[model samples]
Target: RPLRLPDGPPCSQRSKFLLMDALKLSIEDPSHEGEGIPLYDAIKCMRTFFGWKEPNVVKPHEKGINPNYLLSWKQVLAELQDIENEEKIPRTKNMKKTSQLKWALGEELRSLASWIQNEFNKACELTDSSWIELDEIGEDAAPIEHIASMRRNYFTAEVSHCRATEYIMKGVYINTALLNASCAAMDDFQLIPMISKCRTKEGRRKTNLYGFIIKGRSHLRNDTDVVNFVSMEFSLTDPRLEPHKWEKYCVLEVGDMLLRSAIGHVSRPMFLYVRTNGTSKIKMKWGMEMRRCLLQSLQQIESMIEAESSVKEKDMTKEFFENKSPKGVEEGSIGKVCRTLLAKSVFNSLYASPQLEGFSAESRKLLLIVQALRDNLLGGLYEAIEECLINDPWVLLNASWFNSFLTH
Candidate 1:
């Protein structure tokens, strides 16, 4: 149920009109505290204590009373009470009491009450859900267990440091999910629409690749909101070289003949670039092409990991490479050997790798790993960007800078 304020005037009818007017003024112009009071309570209070009736209606003794009448009424009442007392003994001037104590008790009491009220308010605010936020736990540690554990310890240490300083607002746990959610929400609801509206009259701006590069630190963890150790550069794509690099570096590297022929092998710094084509004559891709590529790349990485664990070194040999490479590649010059082998194996394995249902139980984890990565990356990043674009179509102009980061 909703809360309600107390009903009735601030004081009785016998009380001065000054109190009545003050209450009426409070109801008329209620600030934060007074606004919490119910309308019925404010009205009833005026009528009950202030003798309030229809406006401008005169009562016998009420009509001409000054608003300041409450000030003198207390003194008048004190004097009347003194007159009614029966004892009339008089005291001589300069009579002193025997007690010697003269401690500044009133000052002590005032300061103590102030301290108590301060802490009380702080405690109330601490418990208030609107004023406080409970941060989600950090992401599961399995993916990057060692680093995750180290950061978890660091987070605990910083929280302790904040507590030692006696500042409640200074430090607390926070999560990446919250930060990411806030960014996506603001982009979708506020930032994108404002920029889009501003750009409506003007069509999409011309690309300025050189000037669009923005360098910034990566996401925060543990005690740091920003770290200087690593910096990432973001920029617009250079169409001339990006596609070729994507083809040779990402897609080809994944299915390199010599690399894949080595059984139980895994490669680091993998890439899987998808073409968005912002388009060409042959291929047209959706807006989410980059996100889909990331999912595929994750799957490739997982497959490598699983393959390494399942296939042993003893299961491979020079003959395996000979069978895997193209005709005339073996014993050919190094460049000729690579050129011929790469054309046959890289494109074939990447675009049309052999499929077989018979896999050891360990190798099957690749599917699960890929599925999870797909769900998270697509849901968190891709869908969020799409939502912002839907809200403000003109935002696509500004998002053009994003292609630069996606290229390599």
Candidate 2:
């Protein structure tokens, strides 16, 4: 597939309103907190000299004073350790053991836990009233065509999204380039023969199970048809219900016809909207055009990557065939390809599905971070997979799973 930038929705006033409204909602929702402890308390903890409270454990060295005008080894011992000098002998084993003991005691310092509790408490409270349903906020925005474009743009950029169907909120600007890259990569794999499996209460099941799953129809707009659990991609670790478990895992390949045609495409708004009242809006007609171009570009990229990968595989295959000995020991080992493919597969199972915790806006951000990390990791793996397929076709064809898949 050729690399092309999908047409983004034209920058419009309505879209700006939506983008800002969504972002504002996300920010004002005090529940959506970032990771940090109270700075003052953290500083105090550092100042406490191990677990010493004022007058309780305050060492003379910490305060730069000698207690009772006596030079006790205790104060000097700690200060000496702080000095970056090789001239002084290292502390004795007994000092080391005492330090370790102090470290263990430091873990229970009540101040740290108390501060953490306060931070968590702060995070749980939603103080802002700006966060409300889109329908309520954008009451006048019922135009289907405009909303469709807004939604299309929203999804591709991951700027504004639906939380619970009726509930709409704004988030951050998504990179169209990154999104397109993923779509292109996904569509190319879709062309290959595929099988999918998912986890469930009853245990694992195939994705093709009869009448069990209803999915979006495949087209340029639906480049990621295989990633059915995209909604759940945001869920984090939940012990009560393992929401971060792969609901579906699939292996697919492009067929002959798909190889000769566009694999997939997507349309999206170029920018976003944020109304005065904090609602988002998008133009309908232009949104569709944007999506079509995006999807086409995605498909082209997918094909190009696939072609490059194929060339790599052929080159690798040619080398293997050239040195083939009937009995099989070769000049170079085939293990490199295995390592490459395995590297690619390392994160394939990371982001499973969303596990909703008690209602809180922070839930969305938490899940987003997890999913984003997993996606970034998987991106690296994709490159490795490309390398393996290019440098070792035989490894892919004759692997243990390949044999099992064939037999099954």
Candidate 3:
């Protein structure tokens, strides 16, 4: 659909507070907790849920991502890309061959695994509590909104959101525009479309079942339906559970209609909350990321969210459509439409439905591209590192991730 803002103009402070008040009531009220309220209480629970000590394996990268040195997918992905540069260099190439490279990838893989163990949450241990925030700018934000009585401060209201659900925390301010943006964006989530596969031991003559999973749902204010959120849970991987047992991976496009139509955009803001559950049971951990984008970018973002959601709802085994890109192709080969969006995908990692790992064919190719570093629009670190190394290797060598890992 076409671009649209909150219809008329910025909402009055009273209206915004009406939202805050509605949020405040639902988030803090103990009664709402019974409804499976996702944010505030969950954040509080996470504190206790995550044990204290940092993992022995996921040791802090001395030159960590930050002062606190928390590990994040954002940093991990960057580091992986960085190493891909050395994939062919004499020094780096030899290093890639050494057990060290496998160890590092293995280290990173375990690092990723540690993320869940910390979450699997064992009892009475020291646990860590934290979060990260990132934003995307479309630069091409609507000119009309810019010209028509606008306040141009794009603040990070992310820090306060879970509260909009709990502590009745007033995480957003600078008034209506910010809240409006927050609502549209998360409603357009990097959040994945999760699925559940059900079957039992002895009894089953057949184990045919699956669909999208919603962990919990609650209305911020039942009366107005002004705001509400649904949280989805993703379980750890199971070795024995093969692909045939899973359902078609799907995404939800329903948000498009909501954002485009005036009445449809549900005056109330919506939250799509999704988190991982430690089932590897062997060792579990917890960690996650969240984000946003402005106007023009958001349009495409919501557009993508809808596309993915559409797939989430579709019967995938069916015949392919002409214009549709292949399954594994989601990453890379981003055209004009996708380049305008962020490199991150809501569907990335466990945030995606369990159905993802096995089903995607093009994703298989996508994986090869990332691993082999071969592409058409296909630029890989080889091309990048070659240029950078000749121009100035310092840019690649100096980053914190490069020097920090070898110690292990």
| Winning candidate number (TM-score) | 3
* Candidate 2 local lDDT, 1-408, one digit each (tens): 111111322111111111111211011111212211221121222232232212211112122222311211232234334532445332211112233222211210000112222222232222222222222212125554653334333222211111211111111111121133234443221111011112222333212100011011112344322221010010111212211111111101101111122656432111111001111111212221232322333233334334544777632232332223135433233333222222222111110111111112332343465567657973443333323321111222222222243243
lDDT winner among the candidates?
3
- Candidate 1, residues 1-408, lDDT tens digits: the string is 111112222211110001101111112222432332222222222222222112111111222222212211222223323433635312111111111100100000000112222222232221101111112223344555653334334322222222111112111111121233233332211100000000011322111000000112223333323211100011122213323212211111111111232566543221111111101111111211212322232234334334543575432222222233135433343223222222222212112211111111212343355557657992443433433332111122123223332342
Task: Supply the global lDDT for candidate 2.
Answer: 0.22
The local lDDT score (0 to 100) that residue 258 gets in candidate 2 is 12
Name the regions of candidate 2 deviating beyond 4 angstroms.
Answer: 1-17, 20-283, 313-408
lDDT of 2 at 15: 18
Give me the displacement of residue 163 in model 2, in angstroms.
12
**lDDT, candidates in the order shown:** 0.22, 0.22, 0.23
The CA lDDT at 203 in model 2 is: 35
TM-score of each: 0.14, 0.14, 0.18
Off by over 4 Å in 1: 1-143, 146-286, 313-408
Could you report the Cα RMSD, in angstroms, for every candidate shown?
Answer: 35.0, 29.3, 25.5
Error of 3 at 216 (Å): 27
- Badly placed stretches (over 4 Å) of model 3 are 1-237, 241-290, 294-296, 299-408
